[PDB]
Amino acid sequence: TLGPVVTGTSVIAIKYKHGIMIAADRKASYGSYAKFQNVERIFKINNKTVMGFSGELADAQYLHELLTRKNINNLSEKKRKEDMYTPQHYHSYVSRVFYVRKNRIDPLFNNIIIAGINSQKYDNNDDNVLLYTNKNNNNEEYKEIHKDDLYIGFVDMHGTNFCDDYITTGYARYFALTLLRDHYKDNMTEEEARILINECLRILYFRDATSSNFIQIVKVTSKGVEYEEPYILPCVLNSADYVYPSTLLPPAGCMW
Amino acid sequence: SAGYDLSVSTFSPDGRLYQVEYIYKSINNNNTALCLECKDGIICCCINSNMDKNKMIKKNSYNRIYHVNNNIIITYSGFDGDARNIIDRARSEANTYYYNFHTNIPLHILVNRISLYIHAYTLYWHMRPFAASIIISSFNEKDKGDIYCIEPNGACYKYSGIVIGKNKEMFKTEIEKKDYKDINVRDAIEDIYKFILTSDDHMNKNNLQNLVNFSWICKESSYEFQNIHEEILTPALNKAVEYIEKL
């Protein structure tokens, strides 16, 4: 891969009282051409781990296949739920992949978020793993997971990697990251987390040309990994001066 | 024999491979492994009667049933190392197939590839053939169940019920007394326990619960590999012991 051709825009992941909330718009752009409008950019690695990407779709798919087979081998060797790999383990694996490809100067044109639950003490979902049937889609309350038991990690093209209470890629690193550094707080409820993420996505939709308002939300919780129903974010302009007709401005000068 | 049985790459004057025949003897002298196709799934059982004198082994730690993609059972009878090697190759083939085509490898393709892998070691004068018989099985709603047995010579055959290892003749005779295509796996567990108790003379009601491995793929387990829970196994064990004690 000499460079990005078909690309995905930013992803946002945050911690809240019940786990991880990760959001990305379902759009992949072939330059300035929004060719694909229903693309999946968040993938499930196992019952406690998800991966989001921003950048080249081909490299993201390559990494997703690598992680899928890593999970299958883990499941083959598993004897107890403690044997399942953790988000930290997958983050280390992806960071090593990126570092080696940097050394070879054959990078993956991607920024990756690896998020999930770094613990097995909140449920028994990994006692019996189902890969091809999702029983989630019969409702018990969510479990309040400790912040220290959750994991969000970032890897970039040069192999730079770290973790935090919230991670952003792409253009989100400006708008969503400013809003999160201002307003994020620990133990947010699901609705509060969704409201914060929706504000960030709305700002991104207004100020980023490669984004859409068709949003995919994924929750990693004690119930497992849940994909929400994709929804159109309502995004209205915040000023009437935008809508004011141009013919009502003075006809002389540069009023545009 | 007569100098013709010291290598796997030489035929005897009667066109036989005595090394493979000796491997067959070794496998027949080993622990028992059976697979049974039922109405709603397949049950795989392993009787490790050879360890009835190893009283310090961690309970139920020794297992001879594995899975490939979480929906293909694979068990064996023979050398643990050779079987582990073959299972690793089966997992490798499944991984390569998924990488190439983005779908799970079909069971018959996997069986053929494993048969070729096993057969390749019976061709040269510097390699040791695998001393293991493999059982590879799967079940789903549309196709019902598929069971294949691969012999050490690379021959794969399809069955609706198979037994390999020691006492396999008695186990087959007891299994063939009923049609399990119209019996459920939960009901077949008790029959298998009775068969074990009657056939294996080294097995008793005391050691039944720690020298037997039980896995299945069935509707209850969502057609994915599962180990039968002790909560389901214990009542069947008790019923089988009760019946055999009655008679």
From TrEMBL, chain A:
Pfam families xrefs: Proteasome
Magnesium in keyword set: no
Coiled-coil intervals: none
Top-level taxon of origin: Eukaryota
Major localisation: cytoplasm
Function: Non-catalytic component of the proteasome.
PROSITE patterns named in the record: PROTEASOME_BETA_1, PROTEASOME_BETA_2
UniProt GO cellular component terms: cytoplasm; nucleus; proteasome core complex, beta-subunit complex
Location relative to the cell: Cytoplasm; Nucleus
Keyword Nucleus found: yes
UniProt-listed GO biological process terms: proteolysis involved in protein catabolic process
Protein name, as recorded: Proteasome subunit beta
Family the UniProt entry places it in: Belongs to the peptidase T1B family.
Key words of the record: Cytoplasm, Nucleus, Proteasome
UniProtKB/TrEMBL annotation, chain B:
Gene Ontology BP term (one): ubiquitin-dependent protein catabolic process
Domain Proteasome alpha-type subunits: 4-26
Pfam families named in the record: Proteasome, Proteasome_A_N
First-listed, main subcellular location of the protein, grouped into a coarse class: cytoplasm
Any one cellular-component term (Gene Ontology): cytoplasm
Enzyme Commission designation: 3.4.25.1
Enzyme class: hydrolase
Gene3D superfamilies: Glutamine Phosphoribosylpyrophosphate, subunit 1, domain 1 (3.60.20.10)
Keywords assigned by UniProt, alphabetized: Cytoplasm, Hydrolase, Nucleus, Proteasome
Source species, domain of life: Eukaryota
The UniProt record lists the keyword Nucleus: yes
KW Cytoplasm (keyword) present: yes
Protein's recorded name: Proteasome subunit alpha type-3, putative
